[PDB]
Amino acid sequence: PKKVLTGVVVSDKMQKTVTVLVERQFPHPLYGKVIKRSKKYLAHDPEEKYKLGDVVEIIESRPISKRKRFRVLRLVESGRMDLVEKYLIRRQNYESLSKRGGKA
């Protein structure tokens, strides 16, 4: 079975390609509690069909590039920029964590 993942498109910024964000719960090996944990896949979108916010199943597939080894299989739930926004703030944060601050 080619692995199939389900995720949120969080990047349209590429030609014929979408960043897909894929979460996975699971219990922590030593301490028990259920930990969320996520990873971004680059997926092949040849119609530039799928759009920011779409929730797509992504499938294992023969390599298209470095990075691109998945193709967008189908569309689950169309539109939902909460996830995109959720993800978006997470990278907004990054700005703070450095050597200075104030209004930066």
């Binding site: 922590h28 301490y31 028990g32 509690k33 930990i35």
Partner: protein, 124 residues
């Protein structure tokens, strides 16, 4: 700490500091004496404790105790050391193997012979 805490930060494993850098943490380094000396013990002891500064193959210059009634070590004797504090002389962390190399055995000892390094005396 909360579980979420123990999931975020770890626990923290430990670290045995090696009470004897016989560098290579081998069980013995060979060394050459540079000073034979005598040292005063501390706290509630008095006597004259025999002690050599040793320059090691491990690239280390360290001070070792010279166990036994009397020794034969001079400012160029080549010696084998072996690890073992001397509770009285702070900074003396290694012993000198008596009976190996330039360090003679121990002249006429009947009891704890293996340590101190003296052969089984002859007898009918």
């Amino acid at each position: 700490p909360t579980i979420n805490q123990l999931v975020r930060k770890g626990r923290e494993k430990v670290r045995k500091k090696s009470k004897v850098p016989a560098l290579k943490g081998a069980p013995f380094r060979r060394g050459v004496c540079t000073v034979v000396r005598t040292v005063t013990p501390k706290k509630p002891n008095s006597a004259l404790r025999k002690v050599a500064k040793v320059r090691l193959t491990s690239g280390y210059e360290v001070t070792a105790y010279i166990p036994g009634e009397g020794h034969n070590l001079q400012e160029h004797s080549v010696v084998l050391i072996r690890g073992g504090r001397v509770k009285d002389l702070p900074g003396v962390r290694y012993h000198i193997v008596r009976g190996v190399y330039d360090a003679a055995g121990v002249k006429d000892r009947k009891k704890s012979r293996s340590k101190y390094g003296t052969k089984k005396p002859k007898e009918a």
